[PDB]
Design a protein around this nucleic acid. Sequence first.
RNA 1: ACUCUGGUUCCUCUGCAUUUAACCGUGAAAAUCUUUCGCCUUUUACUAAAGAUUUCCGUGCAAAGGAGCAUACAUUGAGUAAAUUUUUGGAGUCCCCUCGAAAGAGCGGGA
Length: 48
Amino acid sequence: YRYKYKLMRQVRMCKDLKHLIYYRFNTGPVGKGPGCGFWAPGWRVWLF
RNA sequence: ACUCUGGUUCCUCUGCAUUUAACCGUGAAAAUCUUUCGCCUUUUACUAAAGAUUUCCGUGCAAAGGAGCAUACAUUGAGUAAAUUUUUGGAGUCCCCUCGAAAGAGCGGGA
Ligand SMILES: [Mg+2]
């Protein structure tokens, strides 16, 4: 971000996808904490 | 009877994918310029909207050439195989009057 502050656009978007993914992932007995490994949405952002 | 060609899979070149309601992309970046908002003692890197252009990751089809695999001649464009009322298994023949040298023609007449 130091060398390209517009990259805050993608930083925000991966923060937004994490909330999207986690709150559907962490449902029922699956609690808070590590293990949410659905890496594909976040990966795509950085390829674009 | 004519000329027309082996299937598949892959590589690469060339051309085209504008009458967009909308869509070569059921996905989604970056830049430049112009303008308008917000940061700010400046510039860069920025905010977030508009308009105009670019680059980049990709897409489709046609056509040509080549490279691998196992193997088949047909088949495309041009063009093949019924004696019972309505058609293709005979209601057909023959003979007088008329106009005209000539040969036909009248819902002509007769067997
Ligand atoms: Mg100065």
